[PDB]
């Protein structure tokens, strides 16, 4: 297809078939080649030290995650980040009712909010126990990343001065969340362990636990 | 005192999907050089090799029904078998039932035949050129 755009003529169809055939040979070698490079140890853009989990957070039952984390780290996490897929669409409801509190006891949470979901984010992180303390802002056009806090952060674990509340797009016209965010988290916690929910394959940085339906 | 590299390894084994990480624990990079949804697993590949024995080279549809519960890509099947026999075009083997042991030998012969005429690329012998 589309039906409309194809030739209905015998001569058009014959030449199209001829050109499709050459093209298939062309892309065949590209596939075989690609597939071979992969076999002989090619390396992905993913950093070595990240924990990708492909799951659905509605279905996901966090307890295994919690148990596994306690088991290997002895602490729950220090920073949680979320770019919810607002109504690919989850109703306000099932995002809201996630049992996030189990996930962390003492640290920071970062949540992305389009202007429509901005207020909703406030009272959903308050529900999870957090106190609103900050907002980063991204210019490209603006979107807010709302920051909240729970527990004691008076440990040496979290460093008090924050590099910026403004963040800037890596590249013109960009729609993936900027990288500088990961660095700022690095400021707040250096070499702590962090969890991301609703993660994408580009969202993976080593030392991070990332969970998402597309990872 | 936390060793992250070990940390990632442990976490992955207990939480990650089997395609994502090795029993080793280390990160399976091949999974991320492919689009999500389209990963070809090692249990997929034996399924295919089984299907050549039972149904024959041409019949991708019958294979898809029996071995993949209908969920494979028929084109991917065709392409994967080209690799299995080491030739670029397999119309020659169409209809044939081949043995997992025979397929290696067929492919070995085809690479043999291949390397020599100098039509050999990326481990496939290009009987068809253009």
């Amino acid at each position: 297809d589309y039906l409309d755009r194809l030739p209905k003529s015998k001569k058009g169809l014959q030449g199209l078939l001829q050109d499709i055939e050459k093209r298939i040979l062309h892309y065949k070698q590209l596939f075989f080649k690609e597939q071979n490079e992969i076999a002989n140890g090619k390396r992905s853009m993913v950093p070595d030290n990240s924990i990708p989990i492909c799951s659905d957070v509605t279905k996901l039952n966090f307890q295994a995650l919690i148990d596994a984390q306690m088991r290997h780290a002895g602490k729950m996490f220090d920073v949680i980040m979320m770019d919810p897929p607002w109504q690919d669409s989850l109703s306000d409801e099932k995002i809201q009712n996630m049992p996030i509190q189990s996930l962390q006891q003492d640290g920071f949470i970062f949540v992305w909010a389009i202007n429509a979901k901005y207020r909703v984010t406030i009272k959903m992180i308050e529900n999870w126990g957090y106190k609103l303390v900050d907002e980063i802002t991204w210019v490209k056009a603006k979107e807010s990343c709302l920051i909240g806090v729970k527990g004691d952060v008076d440990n040496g674990r979290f460093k008090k001065n924050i590099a910026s509340d403004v963040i800037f797009s890596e590249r013109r016209g960009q729609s993936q969340k900027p990288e500088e965010i990961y660095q700022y988290i690095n400021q707040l916690c250096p070499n702590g362990n962090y969890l991301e929910i609703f993660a994408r394959r580009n969202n993976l940085h080593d030392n991070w636990v990332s969970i998402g339906n597309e990872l | 005192p936390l060793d992250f590299t070990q940390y990632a390894k442990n976490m992955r084994k207990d939480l990650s999907n089997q395609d994502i990480c090795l029993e080793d624990g280390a990160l399976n990079h091949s999974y991320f050089l492919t689009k999500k949804g389209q990963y070809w697993t090692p249990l997929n590949q034996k399924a295919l090799q089984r299907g050549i024995e039972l149904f024959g080279v041409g019949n991708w549809k019958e294979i898809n029904y029996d071995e993949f519960s209908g969920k494979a890509n028929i084109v991917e099947l065709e392409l994967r078998t080209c690799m299995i026999l080491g030739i670029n075009d397999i119309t020659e083997y169409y209809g044939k039932k081949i043995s997992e042991e025979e397929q290696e030998e067929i492919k070995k012969s085809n690479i043999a035949k291949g390397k020599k005429e100098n039509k050999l690329k990326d481990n496939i012998y290009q009987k068809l050129q253009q």
């Binding site: 015998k10 093209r23 298939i24 | 389209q38």
Partner: peptide
Amino acid sequence: KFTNLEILTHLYNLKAEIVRRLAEQ
């Protein structure tokens, strides 16, 4: 962007439709 396998799937699907229009003819 399309991957090599997606392109080949489109090409194969196309070919069928053609071959079938050459059939119908």
